[PDB]
From a paper:
Anchoring of these surface proteins to the cell wall peptidoglycan requires transpeptidase enzymes called sortases, a product of an srt (surface protein sorting) gene. The membrane-associated sortase recognizes the LPXTG motif of the substrate protein, cleaves between the Thr and Gly, and forms an acyl-enzyme intermediate. According to the current model of sortase-mediated pilus assembly, the pilus polymerization catalyzed by a pilus-specific sortase is followed by cell wall anchoring of pilus polymers by the housekeeping sortase. To understand the molecular basis of pilin sorting and pilus anchoring within a bacterial strain, we investigated the housekeeping sortase, GBSSrtA, and a pilus-specific sortase, GBSSrtC1, from the PI-1 pathogenicity island of [name] SAG 2603 V/R. Either GBSSrtC1 or GBSSrtC2 of this GBS strain is capable of polymerizing GBS80, the pilus shaft of the GBS PI-1 pili.
Author numbering: 5 to 47, 60 to 207
Write the structure that this text describes.
Amino acid sequence: NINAFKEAVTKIDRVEINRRLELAYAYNASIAGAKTNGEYPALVVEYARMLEVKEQIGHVIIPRINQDIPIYAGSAEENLQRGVGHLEGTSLPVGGESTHAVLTAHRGLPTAKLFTNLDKVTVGDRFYIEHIGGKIAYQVDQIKVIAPDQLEDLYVIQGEDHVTLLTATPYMINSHRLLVRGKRIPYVEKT
C-alpha cells in the first residue's frame, strides 16, 4: 500500500517526476479553465495515470483521527474498499492556484475505519497529502452537510487551493454528504 508508494516514488528520477507533475498541472488548469468558461463539471480509465505509483495516486494523512490512507483514481466501489476515491471531474490532488481536489470514502467498514470518524475533524485541524511529487498540507476552513444532489460546493474556486474530504452522513443513515474542506497552507518538511 502506502509503503509500496513511498519506496516506489523514491526510485523514480527527478526528470520523470517533473514530467508527470507537469501533466497533472496542465490537467488541473483545463478543469479550472472550463469552470471559468461557464462550463458544467462532470462529476477502465487513466485520467490520473500520470500520478499512479503501484495503482495509487497518493495517500491522505489526518492526525486528528489517526488515519493514513492510500488514494485511488476514481470513485469505483472496489477502490472505495481499500481506501480513498478521488472524484473524477475534480482537480488532481497536487495543489496549485485554482484547484479543488475531492476525495470520497466509506464512513464505516468492518475492515477499515476510513472516514468513519471524519465527524471529529474540526476547523483549524490539518491534513496532508503525500504524492509522487512529495507532501502538501491543508488546514480545515469549512465543514458542511449537503444533499447528494448539491454539487456547487465541489467545483473549483478560482484563485484558491482546496481539498474536500467527503463521506456519507448522519452516521448509520447516510442520507446527506459531509464535506470537510481544507485550505492549502505552507508545510515545513524538515519537521
